[model samples]
Target chain A: GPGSELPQMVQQLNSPDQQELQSALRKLSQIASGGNEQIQAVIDAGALPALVQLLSSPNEQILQEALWALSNIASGGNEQIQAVIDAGALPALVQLLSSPNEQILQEALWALSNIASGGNEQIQAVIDAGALPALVQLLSSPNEQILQEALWALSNIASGGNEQIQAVIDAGALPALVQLLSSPNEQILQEALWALSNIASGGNEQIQAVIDAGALPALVQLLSSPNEQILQEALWALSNIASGGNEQKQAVKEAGALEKLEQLQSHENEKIQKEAQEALEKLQS
Target chain B: KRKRKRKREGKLMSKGEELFTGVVPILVELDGDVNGHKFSVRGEGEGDATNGKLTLKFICTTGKLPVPWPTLVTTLVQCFSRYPDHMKRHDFFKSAMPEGYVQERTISFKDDGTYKTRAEVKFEGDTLVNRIELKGIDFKEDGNILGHKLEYNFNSHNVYITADKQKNGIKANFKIRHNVEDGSVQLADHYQQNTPIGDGPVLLPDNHYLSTQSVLSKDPNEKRDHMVLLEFVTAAGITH
Candidate 1:
């Protein structure tokens, strides 16, 4: 019932008129974001082909809304995400990362994060589309929302196979990311930590890259942050690093993670307390 | 419930279960001075997932022409020439093609015969290249050429420019800084800086190879030298 207008909206995407297409994209985007069922309905209405085709529209308004609807569709299940990719979304989304409009970039990053979530192949598709540099550059975005979206996209990518993590690292995302550990924003801190922890989850070399990036002290500092989420994510990151090897665990201990971990182990929040304990165990021989 | 499950999995995921297999994207920036000519290159590359074999695909790549036209024609082809044969099998170097590295634009060149240097004076900042692309920068037979834009981070003093001037016997033509900004500095990472070893000059009768090292974008905060590189491409029977 909610997506009852889905068929008409889908057909409107092919209209020669601009305003109609924009309206359709907006309505389709609304329906896509409604829920998985609604998203499926929109897709079943055969909207995928036209939605992606509109991604190439010269008209920014139509193109922007087109990106929006597709981004919403991307948030659906793996099949739904695959459908968008199957219809050729990665390269278009990748090129759009350079959009002067921040929100367009935001939507692109959001779509990427979802595609990355589907698994390694999907993640690789995003990488092959040339999304890394813009993604890294966006980490320094003056806008926190864009930064958050960028980090989320990166974290998902990093959480994939090692090459994916290294892709993010080699794209020069690591440095920009480490710089954010000192940012004043909570959402920024949390997402940056997520990306870092995922990067750390990569391999011995990957963990070492994090340690080498001066993330240890900053990460330890985050452990003492008043925000529970920051503390939790920092502990997760440190835990990943500590799991590297004796040398790595020692680096964490030597960075005074032990003292912080000990303090955190008794925190009232069970999540922080447990992760701190886990990280401390990883640090110990 | 779905969101909660996703968050839970992030928590439950093992710290070391599988290694990262996602493709690695590489964005390489190489700059340095060869002889008296200065240059910069912006290239993109990717690392294969199977074995971490790196391949640099320099699409939309950009390099400065020590101030161009005929030299531009020969130098541009010469740049891509050696890269094809010699650049392969660097172990780290894979399938890197350095095509035209200039951006599409309206005519942006005018010159004074007095100057022959197209120097890129700027700071090597993360998130920003600070390219004060001093177009048609001329050689300074008297005081200075203003060819060096590579600043010594926060060392706003003009002598920061002078420091390089003193080092490497930085001539009025081009000042090559010997004082590398970061300790993590390793000499012109043959692969990372994306500069070549066997490469030679384009028009000069005397030929020599060039090398450079700079504070790579390892971390944004650490200041790194923006080592200048002016490469001359020697392509045979090349046409403009």
Candidate 2:
């Protein structure tokens, strides 16, 4: 009901003039960002088709605005995300992951992450779109925001089924992820651990991949982290690793995580304490 | 705190200084009859002391019984550290293992300062170490229990027995006899009522096996037996 402006933007979106098309795209992206209802209004107003088309525009500004609008729409419920997906927007989003423009890459990864956050099928869709390789590469981006955004996307992908996680590993994400475990940036470390933990939750081979990449030492080291969140993530990961065979459990033990994990069993915070105790139970077993 | 009270109670001691020294748990359950009813006696205790680094003190616990005697006693049981090199192990009441109970147990010498702790525990008819089964207790420590990768290497395994059901978890810490290079870890703490018998002729610290009861009740014929059965292990292995 809010877009009381006639169908002016929609008409401008299809304008033969490039300037009008770019302007229409920017205006739509702005409206898309207003709120969920506003994003819905833009989509409901037939902005989806035009926005999806603009993603292919050689004009940098139009493409950025288009991606921004799509990312905003993706942030909505599954239905809105599905609309974006049904409009064949995923390939464009995946392609922008390699965009030379920083902002476009950020917007693309953000959109892909939101899309991946959907159900299993949605995650498989992103994987099928061939997003893993670029997502893995962005992990080493000089721009920290892109790198962090990259982790956000990878973690969401990793949160999916076995094949989804293996998709990340196959694209060579583990070693880079493990290296980030030692990052000076708390934000990067937090995201890296989150991603690693989800992968760690997979089968024994997946866990061993984490352990083999030298994640165990850093993970155990994180058990002593002052940040309870990081500590919990690290604890859960190590415990998952501990759930493997004797050699794996012993690997975690020999890495010296068990002591910190045991100490966490009595941590003043009940949440940490319970998690620590359970983790200890697994490792001790 | 126990150490401070000991010095103060000594009132600075005999006007002249005397040398002091030491070093160890035993848990035993002996069920028997006294004068005409059934009674059970159960106990566990520690018994060793060193000059200062490894501290020593006296501890006694009394249950609510008619006379309320020492249900657990460590006041006079300190075995000092000056015995000659004898056999690798010391055997106790092997023949004294009464009826169907878990007949015997053996504890091998195994820690600290630069602390070394290697405790591997298995369940017993005790089948329970005070209701807890601490297995694979391969714990080691540097100087602090807080440090070291010794997860579950609990500082001291404290098994809080439900006050009434079991009262010997704390008592089990004192059953050490360091006279031999590889010595003894036999002990218990028991309390019973109306049982008129004293502990039947007992085994004193230096392996004494005498004839009369260790503690006697007056009116003379009603005897209570506080038979303490001990099992020993040597550095080499267990011997009878």
Candidate 3:
């Protein structure tokens, strides 16, 4: 079936005939962008590593196709993780983070976030290869989604409680997270909330730093939020704080969460009602 | 079969029937043995036949393990029982004439090296009530220590179970006790990438292995007569 033709198509992507290569790369990119299981199969079939090679090739059209394909592949499951890693994808990813091409950088960051999510092995490999500094820079980029994706990647890394947090913190991620809180885009603000939640999950040092850097009020502001998902995330962040010791509770208490929670507990949504109960339980405990 | 016939003639409820009551054996000594060890233990658990739903709650009372306090006690809290061969095979197996029967349930890691989740089923009039709660997790280093290990923290056998309206009077609940030294646990959850919520109770493919339902074990009583025990393990090793 043409559905399973990806492996063969990838081979033709490296063909000596330029037109054939372009055509194949274009199809591969389209299949990846198709957002179906077949594209995932192509990644699992090892199209990703080959595609990474194409991304840095001198051929601009091939690079474009490869970028599109990688972006699409990154949108798939954890299987795409290894392909990006084994193909030496991080350097190219780091390079793209700095590219003025906002769309490519955003997709690249999203892909990096997905890859970093594969497991600890890929996370460590990415951090060890020094992708943190470049990702931190992108956090401050004007592109809203790119900044959100970059925060997402760092936040994913921070949850491990390992060197990745140190890598980001050392590369000045805490300040970056603080800086993003002021972003006018509600989407970016939500992402910053999510990242703060992840960083807070690492416990007091990272959490306190984010709070001290002034993420607490922004986080609490989001908690009294109108958006459903943002409110859920904000409650989750507050719960993670409660997972910390009493001091962290005090941090939240000072942020006026206790009162906000009482107000939210009376809200219409059952999930919100349940979340309020759960959060209040954790906070009191 | 013991028949629990209520003789209350007034609107007053029959003073809340105590369906089942039993105790569990407390661990005397629990060493990290390659094979396993055992201890003398006894406890009772009881559930009442209420509203066709079995509602029951029981704890292993009068065990050597100090309770009502956080006094650390060392007992082989297996996701399943690791009773020593020398220990007595004492079990209070009874066929309660509740509403129905419940069976064919799996538990967490009293079996896997990291398996410590248990599922139980109880029998009611016609419906077999099942309850599962996950306890004891193994968040080991599946990969580099620097990356997030939350993937391994997913032991779906760990959840809470309650009774439905169909139950005679069966309601089950258990809290998870995390075993760790001070400040050893890290809690984090983020859904930044438009992450869809995971499966609910009625999973389509019916893969309950790590779903909250996987933590469900059936009870022997009608609908309400089941109790779930859950434990959460961590890398912090032995909390005091």
Candidate 4:
């Protein structure tokens, strides 16, 4: 495959020779632009693994393109994810997820999330590789965007429609999520709400544990906030819990949501007005 | 696209109009009753999840419920469109009616060209009639919406019922009394006035600049460690 030969160019992507590396990268870029087979060739020929070394490279431009190239390849195929895995990428990626460099962290987490979406074997492999705990650890970090991406990544892993719940449970994902509700940041709360929604949605006994972990109240507080985006995620979470059988509803209702919602019906914020109506509509249905 | 159908009987004109509105969700529990019913009912709810940025996903567990909430929501969308005043909030409902659907029969046009429709329905095993009121407003503009505000008043009736559930999560069960005889709606002690910088609501402040229009904290606090007060006005405190 012409894709396989593209790595011949990638080898020189970081050559000690600047001119050679720049031209090689430019050629790789041109090939990627064509959506040609060489894109896979470069990725397969260890372009992703090379990124790990390039990440710490002194050349900022090279490092930037290396991350970009790895992210782009990561987005393309399962084998590319495997390439990343074998390249000892998980630890570096985990560090990137928690990195203060917001842009790099986001891009890396986005790549990791896409990898998790490939299949259950990959999810388990990720968990086996100790990715889950590292992901959960970032929840307590101060970076909202980083935490958001981390949660998004975990959610994808958990959503493989498998028994990944217990792994998440064992990893203490639930408590990490509850702690986020204490934060005043709306986006953090939104992501936490989404993560909790997915976790509790597993329909196992963990649902009760999540309710007890204080997700319900935290989410309710978000509903009347001026932010429409947070409101959307909150409602979706409640609706998901409500869709569970009476057991979940009893837990949710006992959590004191119904009363707060009833009061919200009279809220001056029309956004609250609409969202409250819809949430009530879903829970009731 | 939305359309309106109006029917009139005697002095009451009942109108039903279709409109597309944003999805706002409130907490309530519903189960498919195996013995008697085909649809669901609200048992209890979690408090309002309407304010968060991703609030929709948290609140609406089931994406679309094909319920009458959309019709009720249409009222707010229309009312807000015509009268942008942040006045008194209205009570909304979304229930599916069976074959014996009822409509009011008194049709008229406002001076401003809006239509008035009314209807009345008698509850089963009783003679109590619920008055249905609807205001249909069609804005003659591009991508126009046919807005209808529907109100069903059962004055002097105990419209409030608490399920046998133990609690309502962060929000509790309360009563809003419709003292139609006195034209007043009394809220019980459980209700509190909403603050301008509302608690639990979400917002996307411009992170590029620290404006009074957003949360104020220059300190690079840990991600979830801080809470930004959604100040009601351009003031420094939430008390405003």
Each model's DockQ score = 0.01, 0.00, 0.01, 0.01
Model 4's DockQ score: 0.01
Would you list the rank order by TM-score, best first?
Answer: 1, 2, 3, 4
TM-score of 2: 0.53
Ranking by lDDT: 1, 2, 3, 4
Cα deviation of A172, candidate 1, in Å: 1.7
Count clashing residue pairs in model 3.
77
Docking class of 1: incorrect
Per-prediction TM-score = 0.53, 0.53, 0.50, 0.45
Per-residue lDDT over A60-178 for candidate 3, one digit per residue giving the tens place of the 0 to 100 score: 54665576567556555556656667778878877777665444555566667766765667778778877788877777665444565677777777655435555666687877787
What C-alpha lDDT does candidate 4 achieve relative to the native structure? 0.45
Tens-place lDDT per residue, model 4, B1-240, is: 111111110000000000001121222223221112123322111111112111111112333322222222111111011111121011111111111123322221222123232333222221112233444343222211122121222112111211111221011122323222244332222221111111111111111110111122212543322212211111011111
Tens digit of per-residue lDDT, candidate 1, span A171-243: 9888898899998756677778888888888788988999888899899888778887787777778778877
lDDT for each of the candidates?
Answer: 0.53, 0.53, 0.48, 0.45
Report the lDDT tens digits of candidate 1 across residue range B1-240: 000011201110110000112233334443324335566545443333223233332211234333221112111111221212222111111111111112111111222112222222111221111121222233332211233222231110111101111221111112222222233211110010122121211011111222212121222352432222222222122122
Where is model 3 chain A poorest over a 10-residue stretch in terms of lDDT?
A99-108
Off by over 4 Å in 3: A1-8, A33-37, A40-49, B1-240
- Candidate 3's displacement at residue A218, Å, is 2.3
lDDT of model 2, residue B234: 19
Please give the lDDT score at residue B151 for candidate 2.
18
